Symmetry: C3
Subunit: 114 residues, 3 copies
């Protein structure tokens, strides 16, 4: 799994430990080993949500499987909770796009997962 | 809806008002309320289009519905027009990827937009 | 086609001519002409792979067609080889997401690549 967060929150507001917490909690939530979890945090972005530049986040989660109705609702509660707690971003100013990737469409280690 | 612009145009060339104009014109174009429109502009990028580092942009628009043949052509005319006018980027050096997102695959406000079944 | 590389490798470690080399290698690999290849490299990123902040890359390749099982395997060998050689990133710390785009879902030059129907 691969999680990306883009936010206008300043880099200094990103707490020590944040990447590791995302790695560990996403490993739990998706049921995949932590060694395969990739996380990417992009602070200080020029963005608006609803025409306002108050804190907001635009995110994505790509996973080979483990994507669906109930699972995505769970991921959103977990991730919005983390963004609210750690970056002080309001949940209703977060978007998360979920992608269920075909193993043939994911490259890794000179090949693909198919 | 969510619109992202990545460009090698410098931040100083992004005009006052640009995010708001994108927000409002996208609300108008998609028929979605302005409150739900998110915009993200990323200047000063290291990128090339056709091997040339002349001004270019790589963009995406994600929407739950309102994606399709004629609508996407209309979005492209609007967005290329804005990028040409405001950032001075040639329309033929712009790519825009359109994504029709399923409501169940979009997170917001502690949940998703699939609130009908559980 | 559009290739994006996001990495925690520093900007100064990105060799001059990297974007041009990616352009040429991708044109060759996809069969699409160089003029239509777009490349974007984003260094100095805050990211981890498997919990480690050693060099890694998260990438995407979008193409209208020319995406699939065998071809994606070939692309991965090519792109990982390039990232390993040029950016000194180990192949098992690289992810590449492949996207087969519909022509109607790619905007360019004030329209899309769906020019056949109205
Ligand atoms: O899902 C993944 C995995 C993955 C992690 C653990 C596994 O056991 C497995 O088969 C696949 C690895 O990298 C990815 C990169 C992506 O852009 C999307 C999904 C994944």
């Amino acid at each position: 799994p691969m999680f990306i967060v883009n936010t206008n929150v300043p880099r200094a507001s990103v707490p020590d430990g944040f990447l590791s917490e995302l790695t560990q909690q996403l490993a739990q939530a998706t049921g995949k080993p932590p060694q395969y979890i990739a996380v990417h945090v992009v602070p200080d972005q020029l963005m608006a949500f609803g025409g306002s530049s108050e804190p907001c986040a635009l995110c994505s989660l790509h996973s080979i499987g483990k994507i669906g109705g109930a699972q995505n609702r769970s991921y959103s509660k977990l991730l919005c909770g983390l963004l609210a707690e750690r970056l002080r971003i309001s949940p209703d100013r977060v978007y998360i796009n979920y992608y269920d990737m075909n193993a043939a469409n994911v490259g890794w280690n000179n090949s693909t997962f198919a």
